């Protein structure tokens, strides 16, 4: 029944998630949960993290695991500005005065995909003028996906996880 299906998925994630230190904390955050709302929340966060790592790899960006704001990313390179909107990008790369910001997401339906694409696009665009005041050029990348498939977990395990997560919506 449902309990054994959850236990099975936990065992599969334990065995088959990539053995990668960057995933360890979120792997545990999922595995320790008992309540359906928390299995959903942490299971989705695990999948998002996996996709972000892949997206950053594919786009030549650093994954922003320290949750640096754009202001902090600039500060790390000795560039001070107090005037930026608060943005914590999924990934980034700052090389000289060229700032690449990467936003990543998964949405299945066209309406939801479009809503999130617009949201992330506008968020990055709103940095552009203020970045110019400190001589920074912005390359804003949006990796919007419809798929949860990723290099950090086998697709068959991904399917089992998502199916179980779907079933948990009943609670
Ligand atoms: Mn984002």
Short mmCIF file of N, CA and C in Angstrom, two decimals, residues 22-149:
data_model
loop_
_atom_site.label_atom_id
_atom_site.label_comp_id
_atom_site.label_asym_id
_atom_site.label_seq_id
_atom_site.Cartn_x
_atom_site.Cartn_y
_atom_site.Cartn_z
N UNK A 22 27.20 17.55 -2.98
CA UNK A 22 26.31 18.70 -3.14
C UNK A 22 24.85 18.35 -2.98
N UNK A 23 24.53 17.06 -3.08
CA UNK A 23 23.18 16.56 -2.91
C UNK A 23 22.88 16.02 -1.52
N UNK A 24 23.91 15.82 -0.70
CA UNK A 24 23.74 15.07 0.55
C UNK A 24 22.75 15.68 1.51
N UNK A 25 22.82 16.98 1.67
CA UNK A 25 21.97 17.62 2.64
C UNK A 25 20.51 17.54 2.23
N UNK A 26 20.23 17.80 0.95
CA UNK A 26 18.84 17.73 0.47
C UNK A 26 18.33 16.29 0.36
N UNK A 27 19.23 15.35 0.08
CA UNK A 27 18.87 13.94 0.12
C UNK A 27 18.35 13.58 1.51
N UNK A 28 19.11 13.94 2.55
CA UNK A 28 18.68 13.68 3.92
C UNK A 28 17.39 14.42 4.26
N UNK A 29 17.25 15.67 3.80
CA UNK A 29 16.06 16.45 4.10
C UNK A 29 14.81 15.74 3.56
N UNK A 30 14.92 15.07 2.42
CA UNK A 30 13.83 14.27 1.91
C UNK A 30 13.63 12.98 2.73
N UNK A 31 14.72 12.24 2.91
CA UNK A 31 14.62 10.90 3.48
C UNK A 31 14.10 10.88 4.91
N UNK A 32 14.33 11.93 5.68
CA UNK A 32 13.89 11.93 7.07
C UNK A 32 12.41 12.22 7.23
N UNK A 33 11.72 12.66 6.18
CA UNK A 33 10.33 13.08 6.32
C UNK A 33 9.36 11.92 6.38
N UNK A 34 8.29 12.12 7.14
CA UNK A 34 7.20 11.15 7.27
C UNK A 34 5.90 11.71 6.70
N UNK A 35 5.68 13.00 6.87
CA UNK A 35 4.40 13.59 6.52
C UNK A 35 4.29 13.88 5.03
N UNK A 36 3.14 13.61 4.41
CA UNK A 36 3.00 13.82 2.96
C UNK A 36 3.40 15.21 2.48
N UNK A 37 2.99 16.26 3.18
CA UNK A 37 3.32 17.61 2.73
C UNK A 37 4.84 17.83 2.75
N UNK A 38 5.54 17.22 3.68
CA UNK A 38 6.98 17.37 3.75
C UNK A 38 7.71 16.51 2.75
N UNK A 39 7.24 15.29 2.50
CA UNK A 39 7.77 14.46 1.43
C UNK A 39 7.65 15.17 0.10
N UNK A 40 6.49 15.77 -0.18
CA UNK A 40 6.31 16.57 -1.37
C UNK A 40 7.28 17.74 -1.41
N UNK A 41 7.31 18.54 -0.36
CA UNK A 41 8.11 19.75 -0.39
C UNK A 41 9.60 19.41 -0.58
N UNK A 42 10.09 18.44 0.18
CA UNK A 42 11.51 18.10 0.13
C UNK A 42 11.86 17.26 -1.07
N UNK A 43 10.92 16.46 -1.56
CA UNK A 43 11.15 15.69 -2.78
C UNK A 43 11.25 16.61 -3.99
N UNK A 44 10.36 17.61 -4.06
CA UNK A 44 10.44 18.61 -5.12
C UNK A 44 11.74 19.41 -5.02
N UNK A 45 12.15 19.77 -3.80
CA UNK A 45 13.41 20.50 -3.64
C UNK A 45 14.60 19.66 -4.10
N UNK A 46 14.56 18.35 -3.85
CA UNK A 46 15.63 17.47 -4.30
C UNK A 46 15.70 17.47 -5.83
N UNK A 47 14.56 17.26 -6.49
CA UNK A 47 14.55 17.29 -7.96
C UNK A 47 15.01 18.64 -8.50
N UNK A 48 14.56 19.74 -7.91
CA UNK A 48 15.00 21.06 -8.37
C UNK A 48 16.50 21.22 -8.25
N UNK A 49 17.08 20.79 -7.12
CA UNK A 49 18.51 20.89 -6.94
C UNK A 49 19.27 20.11 -8.01
N UNK A 50 18.80 18.90 -8.30
CA UNK A 50 19.44 18.09 -9.34
C UNK A 50 19.43 18.80 -10.69
N UNK A 51 18.29 19.38 -11.04
CA UNK A 51 18.17 20.07 -12.30
C UNK A 51 19.04 21.32 -12.32
N UNK A 52 19.11 22.04 -11.21
CA UNK A 52 19.95 23.23 -11.14
C UNK A 52 21.41 22.90 -11.33
N UNK A 53 21.88 21.83 -10.72
CA UNK A 53 23.26 21.42 -10.88
C UNK A 53 23.55 21.11 -12.36
N UNK A 54 22.65 20.37 -13.01
CA UNK A 54 22.83 20.09 -14.42
C UNK A 54 22.82 21.35 -15.26
N UNK A 55 21.88 22.26 -14.98
CA UNK A 55 21.75 23.50 -15.73
C UNK A 55 23.00 24.37 -15.59
N UNK A 56 23.54 24.46 -14.38
CA UNK A 56 24.75 25.23 -14.16
C UNK A 56 25.93 24.61 -14.91
N UNK A 57 26.04 23.28 -14.85
CA UNK A 57 27.06 22.60 -15.63
C UNK A 57 26.95 22.89 -17.12
N UNK A 58 25.75 22.81 -17.67
CA UNK A 58 25.57 22.98 -19.09
C UNK A 58 25.81 24.41 -19.55
N UNK A 59 25.63 25.38 -18.65
CA UNK A 59 25.71 26.80 -18.99
C UNK A 59 26.95 27.47 -18.47
N UNK A 60 27.88 26.68 -17.96
CA UNK A 60 29.16 27.22 -17.50
C UNK A 60 29.09 28.15 -16.31
N UNK A 61 28.09 27.94 -15.45
CA UNK A 61 27.85 28.77 -14.28
C UNK A 61 28.17 28.02 -12.99
N UNK A 62 28.48 28.79 -11.95
CA UNK A 62 28.58 28.27 -10.59
C UNK A 62 27.18 28.12 -10.00
N UNK A 63 26.88 26.96 -9.41
CA UNK A 63 25.64 26.81 -8.66
C UNK A 63 25.71 27.63 -7.37
N UNK A 64 24.68 28.44 -7.14
CA UNK A 64 24.72 29.41 -6.05
C UNK A 64 24.30 28.81 -4.71
N UNK A 65 25.03 27.80 -4.26
CA UNK A 65 24.65 27.07 -3.06
C UNK A 65 24.83 27.87 -1.77
N UNK A 66 25.61 28.95 -1.81
CA UNK A 66 25.72 29.85 -0.66
C UNK A 66 24.65 30.92 -0.68
N UNK A 67 23.76 30.88 -1.67
CA UNK A 67 22.64 31.84 -1.72
C UNK A 67 23.11 33.29 -1.70
N UNK A 68 24.14 33.57 -2.49
CA UNK A 68 24.63 34.94 -2.64
C UNK A 68 23.63 35.78 -3.43
N UNK A 69 23.34 36.98 -2.93
CA UNK A 69 22.62 37.95 -3.73
C UNK A 69 23.51 38.45 -4.85
N UNK A 70 22.90 39.08 -5.85
CA UNK A 70 23.70 39.72 -6.90
C UNK A 70 24.60 40.79 -6.29
N UNK A 71 24.10 41.55 -5.32
CA UNK A 71 24.93 42.53 -4.64
C UNK A 71 26.17 41.85 -4.02
N UNK A 72 25.99 40.70 -3.39
CA UNK A 72 27.11 39.96 -2.81
C UNK A 72 28.08 39.41 -3.87
N UNK A 73 27.55 38.88 -4.97
CA UNK A 73 28.40 38.40 -6.06
C UNK A 73 29.33 39.54 -6.54
N UNK A 74 28.78 40.74 -6.72
CA UNK A 74 29.59 41.89 -7.11
C UNK A 74 30.58 42.27 -6.02
N UNK A 75 30.13 42.28 -4.77
CA UNK A 75 30.99 42.62 -3.65
C UNK A 75 32.20 41.69 -3.55
N UNK A 76 31.99 40.42 -3.86
CA UNK A 76 33.07 39.45 -3.87
C UNK A 76 34.17 39.80 -4.86
N UNK A 77 33.80 40.56 -5.90
CA UNK A 77 34.75 41.06 -6.89
C UNK A 77 35.10 42.52 -6.68
N UNK A 78 34.85 43.03 -5.49
CA UNK A 78 35.25 44.39 -5.15
C UNK A 78 34.41 45.49 -5.76
N UNK A 79 33.20 45.14 -6.23
CA UNK A 79 32.27 46.06 -6.92
C UNK A 79 31.12 46.34 -5.94
N UNK A 80 30.95 47.60 -5.57
CA UNK A 80 29.95 48.03 -4.60
C UNK A 80 28.83 48.73 -5.28
N UNK A 81 27.63 48.26 -5.01
CA UNK A 81 26.45 49.04 -5.35
C UNK A 81 25.39 48.75 -4.32
N UNK A 82 24.75 49.82 -3.83
CA UNK A 82 23.62 49.62 -2.93
C UNK A 82 22.26 49.60 -3.62
N UNK A 83 22.24 49.81 -4.93
CA UNK A 83 20.98 50.08 -5.59
C UNK A 83 20.30 48.88 -6.29
N UNK A 84 20.80 47.65 -6.12
CA UNK A 84 20.20 46.52 -6.81
C UNK A 84 18.99 46.02 -6.08
N UNK A 85 18.01 45.60 -6.86
CA UNK A 85 16.97 44.72 -6.35
C UNK A 85 17.58 43.45 -5.75
N UNK A 86 16.93 42.90 -4.72
CA UNK A 86 17.33 41.63 -4.16
C UNK A 86 17.01 40.49 -5.10
N UNK A 87 18.06 39.84 -5.58
CA UNK A 87 17.96 38.68 -6.44
C UNK A 87 19.02 37.70 -5.99
N UNK A 88 18.64 36.44 -5.83
CA UNK A 88 19.56 35.37 -5.49
C UNK A 88 19.44 34.38 -6.65
N UNK A 89 20.38 34.43 -7.61
CA UNK A 89 20.20 33.62 -8.83
C UNK A 89 20.45 32.15 -8.56
N UNK A 90 19.91 31.28 -9.40
CA UNK A 90 20.20 29.85 -9.29
C UNK A 90 21.68 29.56 -9.57
N UNK A 91 22.24 30.23 -10.57
CA UNK A 91 23.64 30.09 -10.90
C UNK A 91 24.16 31.42 -11.40
N UNK A 92 25.49 31.55 -11.45
CA UNK A 92 26.09 32.81 -11.90
C UNK A 92 27.51 32.60 -12.36
N UNK A 93 28.00 33.57 -13.12
CA UNK A 93 29.41 33.66 -13.46
C UNK A 93 29.73 35.13 -13.67
N UNK A 94 30.75 35.65 -12.99
CA UNK A 94 31.17 37.02 -13.18
C UNK A 94 32.60 36.98 -13.66
N UNK A 95 32.84 37.52 -14.86
CA UNK A 95 34.16 37.50 -15.47
C UNK A 95 34.44 38.91 -15.93
N UNK A 96 35.38 39.58 -15.27
CA UNK A 96 35.57 41.01 -15.54
C UNK A 96 34.27 41.72 -15.24
N UNK A 97 33.76 42.46 -16.22
CA UNK A 97 32.50 43.17 -16.07
C UNK A 97 31.29 42.47 -16.69
N UNK A 98 31.44 41.21 -17.09
CA UNK A 98 30.33 40.45 -17.68
C UNK A 98 29.75 39.51 -16.62
N UNK A 99 28.49 39.76 -16.27
CA UNK A 99 27.77 38.96 -15.29
C UNK A 99 26.73 38.09 -16.00
N UNK A 100 26.93 36.78 -15.94
CA UNK A 100 25.94 35.81 -16.39
C UNK A 100 25.11 35.42 -15.16
N UNK A 101 23.78 35.55 -15.26
CA UNK A 101 22.86 35.08 -14.23
C UNK A 101 21.98 34.01 -14.83
N UNK A 102 21.84 32.90 -14.14
CA UNK A 102 21.06 31.76 -14.61
C UNK A 102 19.90 31.48 -13.67
N UNK A 103 18.70 31.43 -14.23
CA UNK A 103 17.49 31.02 -13.55
C UNK A 103 17.02 29.71 -14.21
N UNK A 104 16.62 28.82 -13.29
CA UNK A 104 16.21 27.47 -13.62
C UNK A 104 14.85 27.10 -13.07
N UNK A 105 14.00 26.37 -13.88
CA UNK A 105 12.73 25.96 -13.26
C UNK A 105 12.17 24.83 -14.07
N UNK A 106 11.19 24.13 -13.49
CA UNK A 106 10.40 23.10 -14.17
C UNK A 106 8.94 23.44 -14.03
N UNK A 107 8.22 23.47 -15.16
CA UNK A 107 6.75 23.58 -15.16
C UNK A 107 6.20 22.77 -16.31
N UNK A 108 5.14 22.02 -16.07
CA UNK A 108 4.59 21.12 -17.07
C UNK A 108 3.57 21.76 -18.00
N UNK A 109 2.65 22.57 -17.48
CA UNK A 109 1.57 23.12 -18.31
C UNK A 109 2.03 24.38 -19.02
N UNK A 110 1.53 24.66 -20.23
CA UNK A 110 1.94 25.89 -20.90
C UNK A 110 1.67 27.14 -20.06
N UNK A 111 0.50 27.23 -19.44
CA UNK A 111 0.16 28.44 -18.69
C UNK A 111 1.15 28.66 -17.55
N UNK A 112 1.44 27.59 -16.82
CA UNK A 112 2.35 27.71 -15.68
C UNK A 112 3.78 27.96 -16.12
N UNK A 113 4.20 27.31 -17.20
CA UNK A 113 5.53 27.53 -17.75
C UNK A 113 5.70 29.00 -18.13
N UNK A 114 4.73 29.52 -18.87
CA UNK A 114 4.80 30.89 -19.33
C UNK A 114 4.81 31.87 -18.17
N UNK A 115 3.97 31.63 -17.17
CA UNK A 115 3.92 32.53 -16.01
C UNK A 115 5.29 32.60 -15.33
N UNK A 116 5.92 31.44 -15.12
CA UNK A 116 7.21 31.41 -14.44
C UNK A 116 8.33 31.97 -15.32
N UNK A 117 8.29 31.69 -16.62
CA UNK A 117 9.29 32.25 -17.52
C UNK A 117 9.24 33.78 -17.46
N UNK A 118 8.04 34.34 -17.53
CA UNK A 118 7.88 35.79 -17.48
C UNK A 118 8.42 36.35 -16.15
N UNK A 119 8.06 35.68 -15.05
CA UNK A 119 8.51 36.10 -13.72
C UNK A 119 10.04 36.14 -13.64
N UNK A 120 10.69 35.06 -14.05
CA UNK A 120 12.15 35.02 -13.98
C UNK A 120 12.81 36.01 -14.94
N UNK A 121 12.26 36.13 -16.15
CA UNK A 121 12.75 37.09 -17.14
C UNK A 121 12.71 38.51 -16.61
N UNK A 122 11.57 38.90 -16.06
CA UNK A 122 11.42 40.26 -15.58
C UNK A 122 12.33 40.55 -14.41
N UNK A 123 12.48 39.58 -13.51
CA UNK A 123 13.34 39.72 -12.35
C UNK A 123 14.75 40.05 -12.78
N UNK A 124 15.28 39.31 -13.75
CA UNK A 124 16.63 39.57 -14.21
C UNK A 124 16.72 40.89 -14.94
N UNK A 125 15.74 41.17 -15.79
CA UNK A 125 15.73 42.41 -16.57
C UNK A 125 15.76 43.66 -15.68
N UNK A 126 15.09 43.57 -14.53
CA UNK A 126 15.05 44.69 -13.58
C UNK A 126 16.40 45.01 -12.94
N UNK A 127 17.38 44.13 -13.09
CA UNK A 127 18.75 44.44 -12.65
C UNK A 127 19.56 45.25 -13.64
N UNK A 128 19.14 45.28 -14.90
CA UNK A 128 20.02 45.73 -15.98
C UNK A 128 20.47 47.16 -15.82
N UNK A 129 19.55 48.09 -15.58
CA UNK A 129 19.95 49.49 -15.53
C UNK A 129 20.86 49.78 -14.36
N UNK A 130 20.56 49.22 -13.19
CA UNK A 130 21.40 49.45 -12.03
C UNK A 130 22.78 48.85 -12.20
N UNK A 131 22.86 47.68 -12.84
CA UNK A 131 24.16 47.11 -13.13
C UNK A 131 25.00 48.02 -14.03
N UNK A 132 24.36 48.73 -14.94
CA UNK A 132 25.12 49.64 -15.80
C UNK A 132 25.81 50.74 -15.01
N UNK A 133 25.24 51.14 -13.88
CA UNK A 133 25.87 52.20 -13.09
C UNK A 133 27.23 51.81 -12.55
N UNK A 134 27.47 50.51 -12.43
CA UNK A 134 28.74 50.03 -11.98
C UNK A 134 29.46 49.31 -13.12
N UNK A 135 29.08 49.64 -14.36
CA UNK A 135 29.80 49.19 -15.54
C UNK A 135 29.71 47.68 -15.79
N UNK A 136 28.63 47.03 -15.32
CA UNK A 136 28.44 45.60 -15.50
C UNK A 136 27.44 45.36 -16.63
N UNK A 137 27.81 44.41 -17.49
CA UNK A 137 26.88 43.95 -18.50
C UNK A 137 26.26 42.64 -18.05
N UNK A 138 24.99 42.49 -18.37
CA UNK A 138 24.21 41.37 -17.90
C UNK A 138 23.88 40.44 -19.03
N UNK A 139 24.13 39.15 -18.82
CA UNK A 139 23.68 38.10 -19.71
C UNK A 139 22.70 37.25 -18.90
N UNK A 140 21.39 37.48 -19.08
CA UNK A 140 20.40 36.80 -18.27
C UNK A 140 19.89 35.54 -18.96
N UNK A 141 20.17 34.37 -18.40
CA UNK A 141 19.80 33.07 -18.97
C UNK A 141 18.66 32.46 -18.21
N UNK A 142 17.67 31.97 -18.94
CA UNK A 142 16.47 31.36 -18.35
C UNK A 142 16.44 29.89 -18.87
N UNK A 143 16.69 28.91 -18.02
CA UNK A 143 16.58 27.51 -18.40
C UNK A 143 15.27 26.97 -17.84
N UNK A 144 14.21 27.21 -18.61
CA UNK A 144 12.89 26.73 -18.27
C UNK A 144 12.68 25.39 -18.90
N UNK A 145 12.32 24.42 -18.07
CA UNK A 145 12.15 23.05 -18.49
C UNK A 145 10.73 22.57 -18.23
N UNK A 146 10.32 21.56 -19.00
CA UNK A 146 9.07 20.86 -18.77
C UNK A 146 9.31 19.49 -18.13
N UNK A 147 10.56 19.04 -18.14
CA UNK A 147 10.95 17.73 -17.65
C UNK A 147 11.72 17.81 -16.34
N UNK A 148 11.49 16.85 -15.44
CA UNK A 148 12.31 16.65 -14.25
C UNK A 148 13.51 15.74 -14.45
N UNK A 149 13.66 15.16 -15.65
CA UNK A 149 14.76 14.22 -15.87
C UNK A 149 16.10 14.93 -15.76
#
